[PDB]
Amino acid sequence: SWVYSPLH
Amino acid sequence: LKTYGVSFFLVKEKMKGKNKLVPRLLGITKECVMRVDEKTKEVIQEWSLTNIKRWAASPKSFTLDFGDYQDGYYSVQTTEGEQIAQLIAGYIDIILKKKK
């Protein structure tokens, strides 16, 4: 699952 | 201003293999995160919020990745690893909102 950020 | 508007969080670290733990303070800035010692309450490191690639908050610890495998991930014990992720996941929305 983990989670990311909008920071592309 | 090594401590102005920055929220410090008491997180514990795992030294080499000591069954023990080492308290540490973590300053979350609006555009960067800093490693603050709990012993000296001084800033030990500084990081950019745009450097964090991902993270994982669990009811026991918090983990972050700068995307630099070589540097390796940085995880510590945090009873509120969630808020630290909500406070962080919250600043990332305020810096990108003004960048539009």
Curated annotation (Swiss-Prot), chain B:
Transmembrane segments: none
Residue ranges, annotated region (Interaction with LAYN): 1-100
UniProt-annotated location(s): Cell projection, Ruffle membrane; Cytoplasm, Cytoskeleton; Cell surface; Cell junction, Focal adhesion
Subunit details: Part of a complex composed of THSD1, PTK2/FAK1, TLN1 and VCL. Interacts with THSD1; this promotes interaction with PTK2/FAK1 and VCL. Interacts with NRAP and LAYN. Interacts with SYNM. Interacts with ITGB1; the interaction is prevented by competitive binding of ITGB1BP1. Binds with high affinity to VCL and with low affinity to integrins. Interacts with APBB1IP; this inhibits VCL binding. Interacts with PTK2/FAK1. Interacts with PIP5K1C. Interacts with F-actin. Interacts with SVEP1.
Organism superkingdom: Eukaryota
Function comment: High molecular weight cytoskeletal protein concentrated at regions of cell-matrix and cell-cell contacts. Involved in connections of major cytoskeletal structures to the plasma membrane. With KANK1 co-organize the assembly of cortical microtubule stabilizing complexes (CMSCs) positioned to control microtubule-actin crosstalk at focal adhesions (FAs) rims.
Organism: Mus musculus (Mouse)
Identification of the protein by name: Talin-1
Domain text: Consists of an N-terminal FERM domain linked via a short unstructured region to a large flexible C-terminal rod which contains 13 amphipathic helical bundles (R1-R13). The rod begins with a five-helix bundle (R1) followed by three four-helix bundles (R2-R4). These are followed by a series of eight five-helix bundles (R5-R7 and R9-R13) in which the N- and C-termini are positioned at opposite ends of the bundle, creating a linear chain. The four-helix bundle R8 does not disrupt the chain because it is inserted into a loop in the R7 five-helix bundle.
Full protein segment contained here: 305 to 404 of 2541
